[PDB]
Amino acid sequence: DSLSKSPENWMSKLDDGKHLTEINIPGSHDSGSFTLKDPVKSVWAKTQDKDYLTQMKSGVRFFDIRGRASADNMISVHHGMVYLHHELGKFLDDAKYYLSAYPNETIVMSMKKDYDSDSKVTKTFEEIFREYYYNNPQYQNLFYTGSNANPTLKETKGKIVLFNRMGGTYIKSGYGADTSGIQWADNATFETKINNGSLNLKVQDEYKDYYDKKVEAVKNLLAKAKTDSNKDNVYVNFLSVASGGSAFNSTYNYASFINPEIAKTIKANGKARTGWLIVDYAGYTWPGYDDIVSEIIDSNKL
Numbered sequence: 001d002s003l004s005k006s007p008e009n010w011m012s013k014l015d016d017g018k019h020l021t022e023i024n025i026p027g028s029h030d031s032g033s034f035t036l037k038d039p040v041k042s043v044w045a046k047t048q049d050k051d052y053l054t055q056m057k058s059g060v061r062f063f064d065i066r067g068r069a070s071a072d073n074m075i076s077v078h079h080g081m082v083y084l085h086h087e088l089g090k091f092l093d094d095a096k097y098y099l100s101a102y103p104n105e106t107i108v109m110s111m112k113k114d115y116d117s118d119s120k121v122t123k124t125f126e127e128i129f130r131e132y133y134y135n136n137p138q139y140q141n142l143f144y145t146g147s148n149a150n151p152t153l154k155e156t157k158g159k160i161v162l163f164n165r166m167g168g169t170y171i172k173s174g175y176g177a178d179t180s181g182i183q184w185a186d187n188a189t190f191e192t193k194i195n196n197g198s199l200n201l202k203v204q205d206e207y208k209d210y211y212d213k214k215v216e217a218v219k220n221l222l223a224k225a226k227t228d229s230n231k232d233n234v235y236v237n238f239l240s241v242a243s244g245g246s247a248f249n250s251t252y253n254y255a256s257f258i259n260p261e262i263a264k265t266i267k268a269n270g271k272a273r274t275g276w277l278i279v280d281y282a283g284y285t286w287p288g289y290d291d292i293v294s295e296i297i298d299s300n301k302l
């Protein structure tokens with residue numbers, strides 16, 4: 001009966017008059033890193049163990065996609081310098097497949113350049129993304145192309161909405177889709193106006209924090225969102241954090257503590273506004289502990 005019991009289609013159960021900003025959305029941090037298998041690399045660079053499709057079926061709707069231009073017509077998915085063994089086309093193919101099966105969901109796709117392009121590349125990262133992906137015949141109608149800076153669920157059903165972390169772009173649809181882009185502060189909680197002043201973006205992205213500082217920073221932004229009804233404010237709250245330098249200090253081990261702690265907090269807040277919460281190891285369950293994705297989903301007041 002709870003929304004989280006059918007995580008494949010939870011957005012379909014909402015009033016589609018809601019602006020995406022007002023929806024409490026589970027996101028996955030460094031979403032494409034599920035491919036990593038090397039133990040030492042995985043400690044710091046692996047943030048997920050489910051693939052794109054499984055993340056989606058688990059209720060994830062915000063995807064943190066990082067890229068590297070590897071050819072003049074190709075973007076490879078990366079975690080910084082580390083190649084995640086697939087190209088951007090895989091994600092978009094998966095997103096299309098999923099949105100076809102679940103046509104009343106919407107997906108927000110964050111796009112960012114994570115590494116310098118291959119030496120043979122002659123075009124900018126943004127140009128390659130814009131020409132060969134956003135305006136690719138296969139995906140052109142898949143992306144949201146409306147002029148609403150604050151789209152509703154109804155306008156974006158079956159669509160991917162760009163969340164632009166590329167810097168300036170000539171793309172005209174999506175969060176931060178203008179020639180200014182989003183002014184992103186390093187390792188900080190910050191707020192900045194985007195979309196020519198139409199939205200106020202409020203972000204907690206203190207990725208270098210130690211454990212207690214990070215949990216506090218997440219709870220602080222959660223508390224702000226809880227008392228903020230403004231449709232024109234958008235909240236992005238990263239539960240993810242940098243690893244230590246060892247197997248027991250992995251991103252996984254951090255998430256195994258942070259995710260249940262925040263999930264418990266949300267559960268014990270009832271249905272209230274949380275914003276968009278971006279997590280490591282989305283869908284990873286631990287017996288006897290509250291699930292962060294499920295609780296974000298269920299926090300949506302219906």
Ligand SMILES: O[C@H]1[C@H](O)[C@@H](O)[C@H](O)[C@@H](O)[C@H]1O
Pocket residue numbers: 029030205207238240
């Ligand atoms: O969430 C953070 C952030 O968005 C930064 O740009 C990046 O450098 C960190 O590694 C990342 O994971």
